[PDB]
Design a protein around this ligand. Structure first.
Ligand SMILES: [Cl-]
Lengths: 150, 46
């Protein structure tokens, strides 16, 4: 597998459905726990197995520990490199916000893409991945947002 | 149990991971994808 952003497609009798997305970096595939639930993944006839997960952060990696290294800081803009069902990839620039939750305070972007985009990378200006789209968390105000940072 | 996988989940590469200069300029930009790919068909793997 080469480094990059990938769609995750599930086969059924009508053909494939895109259930999410993820990032391959340094030998490891990164996606959301809610997308695969730990299921084995295939790429061009090669199997990859789950290696680590954090259900509370909605994260799972395959073939190694977490490799994503971006860290977002308040005020900085990022890009969601969205891979939506039925759409070519699109970069959308946005400024994440800080939100209060019961657990603490998080950085988050708005849930402005298909739920099938879950796993797409959110990148900083250095091209590093600061988080993955689609970790839905509830704020104190009763909003759902897509968390990127604690 | 079964020695077959429960579900056939397949990966398909779609984009380089990078900051897109056009999106910094305009706020949003399509990421040129490849021949040039004019439309994503969800039902086909690649
Ligand atoms: Cl990274």
């Amino acid at each position: 597998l080469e480094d990059g952003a990938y769609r995750i497609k599930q086969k059924g009798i009508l053909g494939y459905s895109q259930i999410g997305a993820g990032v391959y970096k340094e030998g490891t595939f990164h996606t959301m726990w809610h997308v695969t639930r730990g299921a084995v993944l295939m790429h061009k006839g090669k199997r990859i197995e789950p290696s680590w997960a954090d259900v509370k952060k909605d994260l799972i990696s395959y073939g190694g520990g977490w490799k994503l290294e971006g860290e977002w800081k308040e005020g900085e803009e990022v890009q969601v490199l969205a891979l939506e069902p039925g759409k070519n990839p699109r970069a959308v620039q946005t400024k994440p916000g800080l939100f209060k939750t019961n657990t603490g305070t998080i950085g988050a972007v708005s849930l402005d893409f298909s739920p099938g985009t879950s796993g797409s990378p959110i990148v900083d200006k250095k091209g590093k991945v600061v988080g993955l789209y689609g970790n839905g968390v509830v704020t104190r105000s009763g909003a759902y947002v897509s968390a990127i940072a604690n | 149990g079964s020695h077959m996988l429960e579900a056939d989940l397949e990966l398909e590469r779609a984009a380089d991971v990078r900051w897109e200069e056009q999106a910094e300029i305009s706020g949003s930009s399509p990421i040129l994808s490849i021949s040039i790919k004019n439309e994503e068909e969800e039902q086909t793997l690649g």
